[PDB]
Enzyme design. Structure first.
Site, PDB file in Angstrom:
ATOM      1  N   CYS A 211      -1.835   0.612 -13.892  1.00  0.00           N
ATOM      2  CA  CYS A 211      -1.893   0.587 -12.469  1.00  0.00           C
ATOM      3  C   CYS A 211      -3.143   1.408 -12.107  1.00  0.00           C
ATOM      4  CB  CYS A 211      -0.612   1.046 -11.777  1.00  0.00           C
ATOM      5  SG  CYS A 211       0.291   2.486 -12.366  1.00  0.00           S
TER       6      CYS A 211
ATOM      7  N   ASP B 266       0.847  -1.230   0.000  1.00  0.00           N
ATOM      8  CA  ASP B 266       0.000   0.000   0.000  1.00  0.00           C
ATOM      9  C   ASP B 266       0.863   1.253   0.000  1.00  0.00           C
ATOM     10  OD1 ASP B 266      -2.336  -1.498  -0.108  1.00  0.00           O
ATOM     11  OD2 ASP B 266      -3.307  -0.485   1.563  1.00  0.00           O
TER      12      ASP B 266
ATOM     13  N   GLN C 281       6.497   8.224 -10.448  1.00  0.00           N
ATOM     14  CA  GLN C 281       5.887   9.262  -9.617  1.00  0.00           C
ATOM     15  C   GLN C 281       6.553   9.680  -8.309  1.00  0.00           C
ATOM     16  OE1 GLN C 281       1.341   9.047  -9.385  1.00  0.00           O
ATOM     17  NE2 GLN C 281       2.295  10.965 -10.194  1.00  0.00           N
TER      18      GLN C 281
ATOM     19  N   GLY D   7      -1.804   4.668 -14.242  1.00  0.00           N
ATOM     20  CA  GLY D   7      -1.024   4.274 -15.412  1.00  0.00           C
ATOM     21  C   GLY D   7       0.276   5.041 -15.630  1.00  0.00           C
ATOM     22  N   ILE D   8       0.911   5.549 -14.572  1.00  0.00           N
ATOM     23  CA  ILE D   8       2.182   6.273 -14.750  1.00  0.00           C
ATOM     24  C   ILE D   8       3.261   5.870 -13.754  1.00  0.00           C
ATOM     25  CG2 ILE D   8       1.087   8.215 -15.898  1.00  0.00           C
ATOM     26  CD1 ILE D   8       1.246   9.773 -13.244  1.00  0.00           C
ATOM     27  N   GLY D   9       2.876   5.433 -12.554  1.00  0.00           N
ATOM     28  CA  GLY D   9       3.861   5.116 -11.527  1.00  0.00           C
ATOM     29  C   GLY D   9       4.440   3.714 -11.540  1.00  0.00           C
ATOM     30  N   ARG D  10       3.565   2.820 -11.105  1.00  0.00           N
ATOM     31  CA  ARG D  10       3.897   1.440 -11.146  1.00  0.00           C
ATOM     32  C   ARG D  10       4.160   1.034 -12.574  1.00  0.00           C
ATOM     33  NH1 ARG D  10       0.149  -0.935  -6.198  1.00  0.00           N
ATOM     34  NH2 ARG D  10       0.777   0.703  -4.701  1.00  0.00           N
ATOM     35  N   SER D  11       3.289   1.428 -13.487  1.00  0.00           N
ATOM     36  CA  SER D  11       3.465   1.112 -14.869  1.00  0.00           C
ATOM     37  C   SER D  11       4.789   1.614 -15.395  1.00  0.00           C
ATOM     38  CB  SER D  11       2.264   1.631 -15.635  1.00  0.00           C
ATOM     39  OG  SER D  11       1.039   1.359 -14.988  1.00  0.00           O
TER      40      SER D  11
END
Ligand code: JNY
Length: 284
Positions: A215, A181, A262, A218-222
């Site tokens: 994710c 988390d 991010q 769609g910018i961090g994990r991805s």
């Protein structure tokens, strides 16, 4: 500078927030006019995460061709990715239309449907074999074929039918179910194991459409998934493996979608993952 030496000096001087702000300052800034038209208002999960107009994935429809999704093309590497937000209640049919129209083999999901006591996406695939789903709006049927639940991830086989034509295709769903988390994982070992499981499947290979990765935004994990995958590809491909610079690859990838990586924790993790991955890559 051997990537690892740069990692040690940055880590010792305590300067990840500093380096990350620098990448955010030199990042591209292109127009997303379409993402902002009043009609598209309920198709965006977040007010400040939008597809650039030049790289957005267009639906094959005459009504409204809009989805919050970007085509990322890494040329020297010969690998493309589709990065998108977690589907919303009213965009699940659009999501599956995109998968069909772009000829994708795989979908990579890097979030849980619920995290931090809130919904991060819609439940967009069937939970059981005997209870399929129809998406009226896009003329599609989705059926769960098989599920394989592991400790760090779940792999599923899905059948997608375009009910217009009666054509069917098999889709592979790769679900990383263990990102914490808060923050990033302690060791990149399970994330690298997962990346290689996606690679093995054929989901990232040139004989299929681009893989779809998401994710919540769609910018961090991805972004981490794609950054790591591209950097190991180039190390394997070039004559000088040590000429691979993570910061440059990121900025190149930010030409196609805003905001990829991010947090400075996420940038630090992407270095770790590539560094640990290079032991494999390099004959070991
Ligand atoms: C300028 C540039 C950079 C990169 C970089 F490596 F950085 F990712 C690629 C790739 N791949 C490319 O095609 N053009």
């Amino acid at each position: 500078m051997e990537m690892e030496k740069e990692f040690e000096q940055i880590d010792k001087s305590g300067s990840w927030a500093a380096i990350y702000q620098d990448i955010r300052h030199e990042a591209s800034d292109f127009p997303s006019r379409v993402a902002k038209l009043p009609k598209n208002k309920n198709r965006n999960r977040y007010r400040d995460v939008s597809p650039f107009d030049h790289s957005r994935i267009k639906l094959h429809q005459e009504d409204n061709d809009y989805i919050n999704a970007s085509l990322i093309k890494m040329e020297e590497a010969q690998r493309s990715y589709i990065l998108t937000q977690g589907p919303l209640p009213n965009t699940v049919g659009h999501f599956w239309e995109m998968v069909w129209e772009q000829k994708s083999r795989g979908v990579v999901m890097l979030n849980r449907v619920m995290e931090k006591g809130s919904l991060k996406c819609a439940q967009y695939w069937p939970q059981k074999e005997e209870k399929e789903m129809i998406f009226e709006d896009t003329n599609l049927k989705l059926t769960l074929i098989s599920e394989d639940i592991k400790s760090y991830y779940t792999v599923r086989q899905l059948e997608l039918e375009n009910l217009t034509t009666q054509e069917t295709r098999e889709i592979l769903h790769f679900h990383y179910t263990t990102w914490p988390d808060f923050g990033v994982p302690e060791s990149p070992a399970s994330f690298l194991n997962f990346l290689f499981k996606v690679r093995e499947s054929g989901s990232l290979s040139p004989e299929h459409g681009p893989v779809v990765v998401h994710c919540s935004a769609g910018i961090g994990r991805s972004g981490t998934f794609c950054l790591a995958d591209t950097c190991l590809l180039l190390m394997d491909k070039r004559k000088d493996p040590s000429s691979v610079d993570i910061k440059k690859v990121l900025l190149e990838m930010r030409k196609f979608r805003m905001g990829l990586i991010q947090t400075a924790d996420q940038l630090r993790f992407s270095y770790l993952a590539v560094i640990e991955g290079a032991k494999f890559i390099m004959g070991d």
